[PDB]
Symmetry: C3
Subunit: 152 residues, 3 copies
């Protein structure tokens, strides 16, 4: 065989979908081996083990609007028994400070956030990397937005 036995997965955001982050393992450079499945846009964990659960999204806007743009990306985990979203890793970014553009429009900011950690998950647990602003997500990527778990 080739994909070893350790339950793995490296999902990439879908460039077609818009204003929504949909995870696609079915492109080049994407894995979903030995157990892991993609169900409700959430990775489901095959076996009780220890997993590293990184993820990365890449935000983009054109000029800084009024109303403070606070951006967030978080990896929550809904466990078998206690089926509620408990927050694993998270992070906020505020890419705007400015007067909110003027004498020259545009000039786009870019803002990536990365989340990585080692956590214990059981059989049937689910995970899901999500953001508060699917409008700002960016993708003429190939590797700009991703979500993955690997058993260790």
């Amino acid at each position: 065989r080739t994909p070893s036995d350790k339950p793995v997965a490296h999902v990439v955001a879908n460039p077609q979908a818009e204003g929504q982050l949909q995870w696609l393992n079915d492109r080049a450079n994407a894995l979903l081996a030995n157990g892991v499945e993609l169900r409700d846009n959430q990775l489901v964990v095959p076996s009780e083990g220890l997993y590293l659960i990184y993820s990365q999204v890449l935000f983009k806007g054109q000029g800084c609007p009024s109303t403070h743009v606070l951006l967030t990306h978080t990896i929550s985990r809904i466990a078998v028994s206690y089926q509620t979203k408990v927050n694993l890793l998270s992070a906020i970014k505020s890419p705007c400070q400015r007067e909110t553009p003027e004498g020259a429009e545009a000039k786009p900011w870019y803002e990536p956030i990365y989340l990585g950690g080692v956590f214990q998950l059981e059989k049937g647990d689910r995970l899901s990397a999500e953001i508060n602003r699917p409008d700002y997500l960016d993708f003429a990527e190939s590797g700009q937005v991703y979500f993955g778990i690997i058993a260790l």
Copy 2:
């Protein structure tokens, strides 16, 4: 039930501890297992190896001052052998290119810092995670401030 061995620790930082950054155990899905005591605010490694080392901090700031705020996050190894402290992972970032809220008091800034590399440790070595302006720490803390390792 704790399957999969290999020294492992994934520690989150203690919220109610005004500006000090004291890691803790028991919280969230914080781990220390297979002998990685967290002594004196340092993960203590048990036996040599290539350890995946990662950690994240989140600096939050309500309005920019007029003194250029630089913020560095660092993981330095204090080798059990040489006792010497060697800087492994380091990052530096500046939340604002000087604005300094003059009028219209406020507008928060969020600047996360994630560090992660693969390194060669030695049984007894100690890893330290430290920042420089701990007066800039976000106490919303779900799973925002963390430090961790795991044998590979």
Copy 3:
């Protein structure tokens, strides 16, 4: 001494190359274990399997020039099957949201970029980790700009 059966690597930037990213396997903890080969400025892969590719670049400047910078970081795989560079993980950061600090000449900004994911490489597979603004690279640091793979 150096652990584990599995091939790994962790080269590091040369603070001598004028305007380019040159990796090295002899400074910092620049490993080149079991069959990995830092070659034409890229790691040639020893064998099949899931690898953990991670890297980090640092950027620096003082004040903002031509309204838009765009620091980018991409690790691309050039597969022995489909021989053509192909993005694996990418991030674009952009310092100076307009700004253009005329009176705050030489008032510095610091901008890092980490990233890393699991992928199923094969043998003879080459990996490049390249920036777009070597001139914006920071070099007053050690555990600053690295790039490595670890068979897992």
